[PDB]
């Protein structure tokens, strides 16, 4: 067949180390937004109050 001959998308050789696919979950991590979500740490409606 023909699999690796097409280069029209992100493939296994475009990333530097081919073994990074082992983790492949760090992309789907929402990073905590800067200011208000600092209050949810203290609590562990209130988060919006701390943003205010």
């Amino acid at each position: 067949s023909s699999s690796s001959y097409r280069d029209s998308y992100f493939q296994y050789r475009h990333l530097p180390a081919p073994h990074h696919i082992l983790y492949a979950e760090w992309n789907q991590d929402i990073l905590a937004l800067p200011d208000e979500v600092a209050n949810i740490t203290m609590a562990m409606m209130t988060s919006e109050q701390n943003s205010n």
Binding site: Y12, W26, A32
Partner: protein, 435 residues
């Protein structure tokens, strides 16, 4: 007058320097070579290879199969070639196949080394020696091509990984003499250095009994006093080892004149201020980097380090969101975020990224001590002790690791038990008020 003539010389050489190094599919120096040319002060393509059309067809197969990650398949087709230019490519394909393969083999293994401080590797080394004897120059001759110089680089790097130091050093010097302007060659040379007194011995050798092959290199360049790599060696080894400075001032301002827009120089210049505990001036130097070069995940690990002490949480929060958007697989981008998460007193999450930042590249041993600190703020002394202890076992000459391990015992009542750790840290950096 003469400075302008030098500038015209560097452009020809750096255009040449980045050509074959990228053409030979090693990116340690090819990426750096183009960076130097881009930042060079404002003042037909050049190519040439002694290859026959029959064997040149194999080069296209060899080169394209290289970057496609199929290193092993490149070896099989390029087995019977005899040209030194291609012979380096085959063994470079074999070495990177092993170096890559070792990385997938160990990913759960965080600490790297041997507790007391081959056979498959020795197969590559024998092929280098067997081919070197057969070929009819064997260095030490005026008619020495780039490939034979480049071949010695592989011999040096394969020797160092076996821990055969003091023989790889000689090999690098032979390769460097026949061809300078190979940044990746210098870095491996810098790594094998261990103490400042060794640098003085090595620095002298580069001055009295070291000369470049004037045939290969362009004119007005082979002179040691007017070279650039010898200069770049001075700023690198003399300060990363924090050694005694000599022939360092006049060279630094000389490099700033020739390279006013070089991104690497300013960040190193910024790091010098950082290393001297001068943070305010360091911030101004780094602010030029971000504006001029917004996408550089190479020295930002110190930038996000400065911001944590500055307590500029808003500025740091910008960097964490901006850096993470580029990619989350570099060692630095997983260290930039961890600092931002630490400033918000969220340690159970920041501790995760530091372990993440270390897994991607095990060479970044600076993350061990930081990983240890986030345990102490977590009131978990048992976990911290192991975390600090791994750092010193990677390299015993770590002042940060010893001190961070000494404090963790001092936080507990075990005051005397921590005296030994502090005593050991004293010998590393005696000239410090803090210790």
């Amino acid at each position: 007058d003469s400075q302008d003539k030098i500038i015209h010389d560097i452009r020809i050489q750096l255009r040449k320097a980045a050509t074959e190094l990228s053409r030979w599919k090693l990116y340690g120096s090819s990426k750096w070579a183009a960076e130097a040319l881009a930042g060079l002060a404002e003042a037909i393509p050049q190519n040439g290879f002694g290859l026959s059309e029959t064997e040149y067809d194999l080069y296209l197969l060899g080169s394209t199969l290289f970057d496609a990650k199929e290193f092993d398949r490149c070896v099989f087709f390029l087995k019977d070639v005899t040209n030194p230019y291609l012979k380096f490519l085959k063994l470079y394909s074999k070495f990177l196949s092993w170096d890559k393969k070792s990385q997938e083999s160990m990913e759960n293994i965080l600490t790297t080394g041997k507790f007391t401080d081959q056979s498959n590797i020795s197969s590559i080394l024998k092929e280098i020696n067997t081919f070197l004897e057969s070929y009819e120059i064997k260095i030490d001759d005026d008619e020495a091509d780039l490939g034979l110089a480049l071949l010695y680089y592989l011999r040096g790097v394969i020797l160092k990984q076996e821990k055969n130091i003091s023989k790889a050093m000689s090999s690098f010097l032979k390769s460097l003499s026949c061809y300078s302007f190979n940044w990746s060659c210098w870095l491996e040379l810098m790594d094998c250095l261990q103490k400042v007194d060794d640098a003085l011995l090595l620095n002298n050798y580069l001055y009295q009994n070291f000369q470049f092959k004037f045939s290969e290199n362009l004119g007005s360049q082979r002179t040691i006093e007017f070279n650039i790599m010898i200069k770049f060696f001075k700023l690198k080894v003399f300060e990363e080892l924090n050694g005694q400075l000599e022939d360092y001032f006049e060279d630094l301002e000389f490099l700033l004149q020739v390279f006013p827009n070089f991104t690497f120089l300013k960040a190193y210049n910024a790091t010098i201020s950082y290393n001297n505990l001068d943070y305010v001036t360091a911030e101004s130097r780094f602010d030029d980097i971000v504006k001029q070069d917004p996408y550089r995940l190479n020295d930002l690990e110190t930038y996000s380090n400065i911001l944590y002490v500055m307590q500029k949480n808003s500025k740091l929060a910008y960097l964490a969101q901006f850096v993470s958007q580029i990619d989350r697989f570099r060692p630095e981008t997983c260290c930039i975020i961890a600092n931002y998460y630490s400033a918000r007193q969220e340690h159970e999450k920041s501790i995760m990224y530091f372990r993440r930042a270390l897994t991607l590249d095990k060479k970044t041993t600076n993350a061990w001590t930081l990983m240890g600190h986030e345990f102490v703020e977590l009131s978990n002394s048992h976990a911290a002790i192991e975390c600090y202890r791994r750092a010193v076992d990677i390299c015993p000459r770590d002042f940060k690791a010893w001190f961070g391990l000494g404090q963790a015992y001092a936080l507990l009542d075990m005051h005397l038990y921590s005296l030994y750790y502090f005593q050991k840290a004293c010998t590393l950096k005696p000239w410090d008020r803090r210790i």
